[PDB]
């Protein structure tokens, strides 16, 4: 099987990559990092985010990977210790595929679409920041504050969290939109986190300013012209390798508890 | 066909359950109020609670329908003027089923078993409240504070979003888990609200009181002895009829925004 | 001077308790539980609360020491290993005094007054709970939830903190009232906690029932007949004995970061 | 007296500027951009702060007066149908002043010093953003996320307000920091907005990036080559005209209760 390796670049990272390059030579892999069935991330969950960047154009084909070589990452979720139990079962195809729900984002100016694995969000570009929110074609808020954030299931552990979202299962087909920071006194908005399902699709629409600051993952990116930003949960999955039970619920408190 | 109306028994609500019962008549419509295939409820999201109640031993049987004589209720969502309307749709039988999920509340000392549709919670009783939070049998946390509420999708507009917790359209079916006052210095939470798909049980065990105060919507029901409260999606949805379109997102809207 | 020690009861605090005993002794000290002029307490945070409440009625008379037989406390602040050490200069008084503000609750049916170290709550007694609350004279919010927790700047750091409050150094001679899970829909708050300088007054008044639960720090206190519940900053304050530069901003950083 | 008026520049606030210009005529007034005893502004809270930073140099000469053509403001807070009511009395000098307690911003890269009205800001520039927090002298945490917030009392009701602060009577003479969206799971904050008094100084160290976004009131401002920036209660304070009774927990209300 065709397969590639990551590395945060650090020298504990590509030490193992060459390590673990060495240990598939010994098994009928070959390194392709243009048409991989296999990434292998090695580093922390921003090193993994880049991985599942470099190849969202293939993610029907491929099953990702991730290796931590610091702290516990929710995408990054193996241990270095473990690397040479994994090229074993890699090679010799014990593992099963579990797939994780993406965020769709279209931005019309024509259109731009981009797949979320955390979250897309929206900023100015000089303080607030006017839009109007949009669902299935009727208005429901006018939002003024610092921005907005649709988040994934597995992306509400990440920006979600620390602006007040709900940890979603990530079993769960949804998105979840929060705010920034939004004025309340005009100007009303639900304060709530809002989760939507499937066929769900969320606008966002500018008021006076139409120039933003809009992030998928860690990529932003100031968008010129925009009449509008779409969301809704992506008809296309990213496929982890397993492997062993790790829940996610196990994750979130060996992240964040213990 | 067989119908029963509750009425929140003020002046308004009492006239207006009269002149449905004559309108009923004039149709192929019996009132019992022991075997009814729909529930009528007049008043607002309170009395429908009630009516639910009344009747969850015959949930599958039931097509639920709320009238609010006052302010626009997330279950109560019918205005008075539209009764006389409504009457000759129910009796030439011109309405889908629409169904949101419930909360299954399991209580060990035996065993009881609850159904919530907007939430349940769990108090003391004095002050805090010590429970070990336990999700699909690994422990999760010790929580220390004043209680938690385990929610219902269309709950999650209630107690659950006073808490902080998100907002989640109805047609999802899971259970969200918020915190009341939790104790962060021993002694660490999660924070954030937690949603579970269906087949996850989360489950509270007592560390040293074991009575508690256990409320499933509008009953509440001091408990003596318990060793345990379960939770989890219910296999059991409670039916409403419709009619008409009018989104949930609207009514999050027309109930908290304008 | 005359010395009285509490302990919290355990073995550790009963051995310290009567080491220092003997240790004072050794001086000019007197063991007085009656009229003493320090007051040191030996447990945690819990056993001081109960120290102040002991001692109320002579607060101008006293200076108070917190001694931690477990973890860093707020107002029990020194480590037992310095037990002794300050045996010696309690005894050979090379001390100074801080005082921190205390909170005034009046409880109108005849008028009952109590003093607050760290808060005062109300809530009822059954769900909510509905209160009109009035800021000097001026009826500013009606509210209805869980309850209200009106805290002074040495308790930001306790109940407050958990329900949102923010943390406010005890030089500030104010008080901080919060909400406990308010809906807001009739209904309507402020939602954010607010802070009051001395002299002002905030008055909570009943709407329906009149029966509530009303706690001053670890006492609680259902309430029968209730016209009001005032709250100010009391003109007593609390004085502590130091001894050494223990910073609240450390005290906050030791408990809560790391 | 020597007056100027400031106006928001739409043709409700021009015209009742020449007005209130005309009705100053009758009386011994003069117009003075320069260097006035008195500066009114018409229009919003926004024309208000604009109004503080043109004539920041001159605080202690000049008193404040802030007349609302739109919505009622916190800074102003006076109808246009009182205009000519309030040229008398400025004329005949019927007038008391309070004054609101002010936050002083020291930037090092040289130092840079500025006096903000409503609050300071800190932001990047690209995403977070890490920085060390130190209250006088001793390191209190390490900040990774968006941003932080450094308010006045009469602050607390904007920025402050959205990001979970406290509102403080502004007769309090302390600064509030409230955090913008911070990670917690490395990597520690306290969470809770902090309050502190007079002569406390709150210090912003850089970690990596030194080109940080700095905001004070309406004005911003990346500044490039920063080692520090320094935050304590100004020894100066704003002076505004009154008039009438119109308290603080009252404008409160009146804009975000009723
Ligand atoms: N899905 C996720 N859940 C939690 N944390 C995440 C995450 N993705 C990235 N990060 C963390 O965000 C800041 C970086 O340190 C990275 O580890
Ligand atoms: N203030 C913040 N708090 C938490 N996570 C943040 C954050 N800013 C960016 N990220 C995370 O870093 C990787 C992105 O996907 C986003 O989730
Ligand atoms: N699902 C729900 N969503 C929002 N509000 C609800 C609700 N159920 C009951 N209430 C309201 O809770 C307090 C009562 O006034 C009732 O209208
Ligand atoms: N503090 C509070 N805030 C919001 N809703 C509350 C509440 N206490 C009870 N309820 C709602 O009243 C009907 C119950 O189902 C619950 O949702
Ligand atoms: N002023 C205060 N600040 C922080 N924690 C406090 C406190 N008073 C009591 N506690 C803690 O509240 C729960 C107990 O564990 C006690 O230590
Ligand atoms: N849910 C809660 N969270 C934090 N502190 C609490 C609490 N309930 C009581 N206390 C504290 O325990 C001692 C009291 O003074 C109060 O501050
Ligand atoms: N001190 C304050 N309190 C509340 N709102 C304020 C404020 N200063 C400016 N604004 C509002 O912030 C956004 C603008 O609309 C302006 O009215
Ligand atoms: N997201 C936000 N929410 C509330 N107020 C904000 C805000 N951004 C800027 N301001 C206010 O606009 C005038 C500034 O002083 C600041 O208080």
């Given at each position: 099987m065709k397969y590639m390796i990551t590395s945060k670049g650090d020298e504990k990272s590509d030490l193992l990559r060459l390590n673990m390059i060495?240990?598939?030579?010994?098994?009928?892999?070959?390194?392709?990092?243009?048409?991989?069935?296999?990434?292998?991330?090695?580093?922390?969950?921003?090193?993994?985010?880049?991985?599942?960047?470099?190849?969202?154009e293939r993610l029907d084909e491929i099953a990702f990977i991730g290796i931590h070589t610091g702290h516990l990452g929710?995408?990054?979720?193996?241990?270095?210790?473990?690397?040479?139990?994994?090229?074993?079962?890699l090679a010799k195809g014990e593992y099963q595929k579990v797939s994780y729900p993406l965020l769709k984002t279209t931005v019309k100016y024509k259109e731009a679409t981009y797949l979320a694995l955390n979250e897309?969000?929206?900023?100015?570009?000089?303080?607030?920041?006017?839009?109007?929110?949009?669902?299935?074609?009727?208005?429901?808020?006018?939002?003024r504050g610092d921005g907005l954030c649709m988040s994934?299931?597995?992306?509400?552990?990440?920006?979600?969290?620390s602006l007040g979202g709900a940890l979603m299962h990530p079993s769960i087909e949804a998105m979840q939109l929060t705010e920034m920071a939004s004025i309340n006194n005009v100007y009303r908005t639900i304060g709530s986190p809002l989760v939507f399902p499937k066929?769900?699709?969320?606008?966002?629409?500018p008021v006076n300013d139409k120039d933003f600051q809009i992030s998928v993952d860690h990529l932003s990116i100031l968008h010129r012209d925009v009449?509008?930003?779409?969301?809704?949960?992506?008809?296309?999955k990213i496929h982890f390798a397993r492997f062993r039970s790790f829940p996610f619920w196990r994750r979130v408190h060996?992240?964040?508890?213990e």
């Open positions: 060495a240990g598939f030579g010994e098994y009928d892999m070959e390194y392709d990092d243009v048409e991989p069935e296999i990434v292998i991330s090695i580093g922390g969950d921003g090193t993994f985010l880049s991985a599942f960047h470099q190849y969202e929710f995408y990054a979720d193996w241990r270095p210790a473990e690397a040479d139990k994994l090229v074993k079962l897309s969000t929206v900023k100015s570009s000089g303080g607030p920041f006017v839009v109007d929110v949009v669902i299935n074609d009727i208005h429901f808020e006018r939002f994934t299931p597995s992306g509400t552990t990440a920006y979600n969290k066929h769900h699709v969320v606008s966002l629409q009449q509008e930003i779409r969301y809704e949960v992506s008809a296309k060996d992240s964040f508890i």
